[PDB]
């Protein structure tokens, strides 16, 4: 066969996705999630396509940056693997969590 050591394709994918700018969540699942969340606020609502695009650009930027901070917390704990506690510490410090 052939097998790369664990972590090699992870690094290839880091280099790859830090090189590009296209969105990483599939557009229709995200759109349906947006409509679902919005219904619980006001029923019978329409969305401009650009409004969903704005929500997705913003959400993904938020998640990428949050994963940066999470990564720094993990490294702080001498670890290479991100864990929910790294996210929770990140958000705690960001002032989102209490």
């Amino acid at each position: 066969p052939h097998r790369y050591r664990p972590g090699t394709v992870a690094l290839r994918e880091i280099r790859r996705y830090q090189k590009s700018t296209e969105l990483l969540i599939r557009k229709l699942p995200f759109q349906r999630l947006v409509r679902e969340i919005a219904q619980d606020f006001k029923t019978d609502l329409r969305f401009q396509s650009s409004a969903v695009m704005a929500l997705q650009e913003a959400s993904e930027a938020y998640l990428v940056a949050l994963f940066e901070d999470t990564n720094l917390c993990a490294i702080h704990a001498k670890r290479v693997t991100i864990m929910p506690k790294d996210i929770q510490l990140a958000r705690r410090i960001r002032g989102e969590r209490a």
Binding site: R5, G7, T8, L11, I14, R15, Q18, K19, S20, T21, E22, E57, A58, A61, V64, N71, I75, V80
Partner: protein
């Protein structure tokens, strides 16, 4: 026009209009739009400068948003001015943490 008299490419008329229609204060002085339009033009040129540079480094003739993002996030001071801003379609800077590299 007030732009020529000030030597600006940016519209002093439009900026004076917006400052009045914007409920910033009762009255807007005659120098205010000129100064502001000039600051706006200056920062514009700073970002266009650095992002045309990015474009050329990337072998392009045309500025796309990634070039603006490269521009802003490689410049310390622009990076700080836009630190809570998100540049649609601009991506991130290539940066892998050291300990993740194979030894």
């Amino acid at each position: 026009t007030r732009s020529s008299r000030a030597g600006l490419q940016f519209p002093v008329g439009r900026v004076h209009r917006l400052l009045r229609k914007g409920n910033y204060a009762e009255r807007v002085g005659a120098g205010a739009p000129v100064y502001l339009a000039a600051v706006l033009e200056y920062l514009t040129a700073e970002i266009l400068e650095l992002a045309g540079n990015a474009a050329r480094d990337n072998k392009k003739t045309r500025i796309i948003p990634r070039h603006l993002q490269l521009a802003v996030r490689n410049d310390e001071e622009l990076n700080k001015l836009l630190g809570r801003v998100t540049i649609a379609q601009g991506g991130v800077l290539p940066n892998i943490q050291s300990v993740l590299l194979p030894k």
